[PDB]
Amino acid sequence: MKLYYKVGAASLAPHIILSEAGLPYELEAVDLKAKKTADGGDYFAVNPRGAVPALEVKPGTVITQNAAILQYIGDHSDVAAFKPAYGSIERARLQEALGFCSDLHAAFSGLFAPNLSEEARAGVIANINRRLGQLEAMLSDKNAYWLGDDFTQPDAYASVIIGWGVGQKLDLSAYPKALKLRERVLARPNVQKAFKEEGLN
Amino acid sequence: MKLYYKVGAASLAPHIILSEAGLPYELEAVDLKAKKTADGGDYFAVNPRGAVPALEVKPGTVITQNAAILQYIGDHSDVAAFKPAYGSIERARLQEALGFCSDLHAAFSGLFAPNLSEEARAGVIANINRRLGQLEAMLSDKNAYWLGDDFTQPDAYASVIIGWGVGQKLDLSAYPKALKLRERVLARPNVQKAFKEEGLN
Numbered sequence A, B: 001m002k003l004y005y006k007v008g009a010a011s012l013a014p015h016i017i018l019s020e021a022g023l024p025y026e027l028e029a030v031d032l033k034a035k036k037t038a039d040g041g042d043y044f045a046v047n048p049r050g051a052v053p054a055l056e057v058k059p060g061t062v063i064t065q066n067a068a069i070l071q072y073i074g075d076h077s078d079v080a081a082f083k084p085a086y087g088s089i090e091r092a093r094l095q096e097a098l099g100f101c102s103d104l105h106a107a108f109s110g111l112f113a114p115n116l117s118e119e120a121r122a123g124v125i126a127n128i129n130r131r132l133g134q135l136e137a138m139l140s141d142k143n144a145y146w147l148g149d150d151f152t153q154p155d156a157y158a159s160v161i162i163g164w165g166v167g168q169k170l171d172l173s174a175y176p177k178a179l180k181l182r183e184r185v186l187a188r189p190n191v192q193k194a195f196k197e198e199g200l201n
C-alpha cells in the first residue's frame, strides 16, 4: 500500500501504524501548498478533499480519512489490539477514541491557519485547552495506554497531535497522563522508525 | 439501548439508524444549555465531552462519538449494508464517509455558535460551501445512495446535516445530488418514524 503524507502532519499516525503492523508500504510526500505530489502531479486526483493522509490500497483504490485508514491497516495486520471484532465494546472504544482524536485535531488545526489574529488565536488556545482537559480526563491510570493494556491506533494519533503542541512550545505540563502516553509511544521502536522515515527527531 | 439526543441535532442520525435496525431502544432528551438530563441530573456524567449523541448500550457502558455509535448499532443489527466486514473495502468506504460527515458537521457547527459576527459568519459560510462542494463531487449518479445501491449510516448523517442548511434557508440548489440523497432518505418510513419521535416534521 502507498501512504500519502506530509512531514509531521496527521498522516504520521497511519505511518506509525503501518510500521508497527510490519506490512510492506511505500511513502509519498505531498506539497500541500501547491497541492502536488512529488512528481508534480495533481494531489486532488489522489484526495479531492486535498488532505493527508490518503492510503492507496491498490491502484484505483484510495482511502481517505484517518479513522478509515487507521482501521483498514489494523484489520489487515496481525496485531489483535488493532482489530477488535466489529460490534464488540472494544471496537466501539477504538472508534470512540479515534473520533475524539478528530476533535482534538480540529482544535489544534486552528493554530496553523494563515493570517491568524492574536484574538482569534486566543479562542483556538481556549479550545485546545478544553480538548486537552477532556483527553486528560478520559485517560485512566489503570491503563498503560489509552484503551487498556495494549497500544492501539488512537495512541499514535493522540501522540502526534500532542507533539504539535510541543512543537509550538505550549505548556502541557497540566496534562501528565497525556504526556506520559506520548512518552510511552515515542519510545516504541517502530514509532521511532516512522519518525526517521519522515526525517524527524 | 438508550439514546441521548437533542431535537434536530446530530443525534438524529443514530436515532434514524436505531429505527431502521428495528432493535428496541429508549430515548433521553438532553438540555444542552444547562447540560442536564430530563430528570435534572448532570449530563456530563453521561458524556464528559458534553455532546449528543451518547448511546448507553447497557448500564455502565456509554459510547460517545457518532462514528462509533452508528457502527455499533449497525454491527448489532441484521442489516447487512450497515455492517460490512472489517477490513473489506466496503467497511473502509463506510468509515471514510462517516469521517467526512464529521468534517461537514464541523463546518455547519460554526453557524450556530453564540455571538457570531457577520464577518466570522461569512467564513463559516465559505467553509460550508467548500464542504458541500466536496460532498457533491463525492456522490456519483451511478449510486442510489452515497456508498452504492444500499442505504447506510452515512446517508442518514449527511441528510441531517444538510437539513440544518435547509432550516437556515441556505440556498443548496447548486448541490442537486446532495438534495436528492436527502429527499430519498426523508421518504424512508423508518426515517419519518424517527423524526416523529423527536416532534419534528
Ligand SMILES: N[C@H](CCC(=O)N[C@@H](CS)C(=O)NCC(=O)O)C(=O)O
Pocket (backbone or CB within 6 Å): A006, A007, A008, A009, A010, A011, A051, A052, A053, A108, A109, A110, A112, A164, A167
Ligand atoms: N506544522 C505542521 C504540523 C502538522 C499540521 O499542522 N498539519 C495539519 C494536520 S495533518 C494541521 O495541524 N492543520 C491543518 C490540517 O490538519 O490539514 C508540521 O510540523 O508538519
Ligand SMILES: N[C@H](CCC(=O)N[C@@H](CS)C(=O)NCC(=O)O)C(=O)O
Pocket (backbone or CB within 6 Å): B006, B007, B008, B009, B010, B011, B051, B052, B053, B108, B109, B110, B112, B164, B167
Ligand atoms: N439548531 C439545531 C441544529 C442542531 C445543532 O446545531 N446541533 C449541533 C450538532 S448536534 C450543531 O449543529 N452545532 C453544535 C454541535 O454540533 O454540538 C436544531 O434545530 O436542533
